Amino acid sequence: VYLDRKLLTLEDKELGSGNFGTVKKGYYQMKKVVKTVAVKILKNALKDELLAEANVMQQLDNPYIVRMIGICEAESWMLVMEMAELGPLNKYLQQNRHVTDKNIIELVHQVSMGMKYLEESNFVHRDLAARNVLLVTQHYAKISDFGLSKALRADENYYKAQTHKWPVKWYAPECINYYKFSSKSDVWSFGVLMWEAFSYGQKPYRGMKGSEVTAMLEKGERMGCPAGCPREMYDLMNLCWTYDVENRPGFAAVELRLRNYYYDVVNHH
Numbered sequence: 001v002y003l004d005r006k007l008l009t010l011e012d013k014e015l016g017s018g019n020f021g022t023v024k025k026g027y028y029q030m031k032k033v034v035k036t037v038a039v040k041i042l043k044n045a046l047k048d049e050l051l052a053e054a055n056v057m058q059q060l061d062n063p064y065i066v067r068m069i070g071i072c073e074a075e076s077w078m079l080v081m082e083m084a085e086l087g088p089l090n091k092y093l094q095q096n097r098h099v100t101d102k103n104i105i106e107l108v109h110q111v112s113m114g115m116k117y118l119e120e121s122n123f124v125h126r127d128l129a130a131r132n133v134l135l136v137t138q139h140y141a142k143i144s145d146f147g148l149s150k151a152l153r154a155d156e157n158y159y160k161a162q163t164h165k166w167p168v169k170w171y172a173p174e175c176i177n178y179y180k181f182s183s184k185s186d187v188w189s190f191g192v193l194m195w196e197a198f199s200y201g202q203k204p205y206r207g208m209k210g211s212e213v214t215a216m217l218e219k220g221e222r223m224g225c226p227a228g229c230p231r232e233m234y235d236l237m238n239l240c241w242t243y244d245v246e247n248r249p250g251f252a253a254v255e256l257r258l259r260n261y262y263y264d265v266v267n268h269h
C-alpha cells in the first residue's frame with residue numbers, strides 16, 4: 001500500500017543498519033489512532049529489492065510474522081512496519097541472562113508456528129537467524145527481515161540462486177553446495193536459531209571461518225549442547241541439522257515436537 005509522507009514522523013533512534021541504508025523508529029497515523037513503526041529507509045536494483053520485500057510481506061498474515069503497514073515514496077523509498085519494540089532476540093538474550101528455559105521454548109515454538117505458515121504458503125525465508133526474530137513482548141516473538149525471501153515456483157519446492165554476501169553459518173549444505181533454497185533449508189537455519197536462543201544470543205561457530213564451518217559439517221560434526229539446554233531441545237537441533245535434505249523434518253514436524261514439549265513443560269512444575 002502507498003502511504004502519505006506527511007502522516008509519518010521519523011525519530012533519531014536507529015534500530016538497524018546495512019548496505020541498503022537504515023531502520024528508524026517512527027509513528028504513523030491510522031484511521032483514528034497513531035501507530036509506533038519501524039521504517040526501513042533506503043540510502044540516496046536496491047529499489048526493486050525493497051518493492052519485492054514489500055510484495056512478500058503484503059502476502060503474509062500470521063501472528064508470528066512482522067506486519068507491513070505499507071510503502072512510502074517520498075525523499076527516499078521506505079518500508080513501514082509495525083514495531084516489535086523489544087528488538088532482536090539475540091541482543092535481548094545477551095542482555096537478559098535470567099530468561100527461563102520454559103520462556104525460550106515458548107519463543108522458539110512461536111518462531112516454528114510462523115515458519116510452518118511460511119512453509120504452508122510456499123515462501124522460503126533464506127535469512128532465518130536469532131537477529132531476525134523480533135520481540136513484541138518477552139513472551140511474543142515475530143519473524144522479520146524478508147529481504148532475501150522468495151515465492152517458490154508452482155512446479156518446484158526450491159529456489160535456485162544465480163549469484164552467491166550470504167549468512168553462511170546459518171545455511172544448509174545444499175544451499176552452499178548447490179545454491180538450492182527450500183523450506184527444509186529454512187529448518188537447518190531454525191536449528192542454528194535454536195542453538196543461538198539456548199546459548200543466550202552467543203554467535204554460532206565462534207572464531208571459525210565460513211569455509212572451516214563447511215568442512216566441520218561435511219565430517220558429520222555439529223555444535224555441542226548449550227549450558228543448561230534441555231536434552232529434548234538439543235535432540236531437535238540435531239534433527240534440524242540432518243545433512244540429507246530428504247531425511248530432514250519439515251516445519252509441520254518441527255512445530256508439533258515443540259508444541260508437545262512446550263505443553264508438557266507448562267503442565268509440569
Ligand SMILES: CN(C)c1ccc(-c2cc3ncccc3c(NCCCN)n2)cc1
Nearest residue numbers: 015016023038081082083084085086087131
Ligand atoms: C531495543 N532495541 C535496541 C531495538 C532494536 C531494533 C528494533 C527493531 C524493531 C523492528 N520492528 C519491526 C520491523 C523491523 C524492526 C527492526 N529492524 C532492523 C534489524 C532487525 N534484524 N528493529 C527494536 C528495538
Ligand SMILES: [Cl-]
Nearest residue numbers: 167168169170
Ligand atoms: Cl555467516
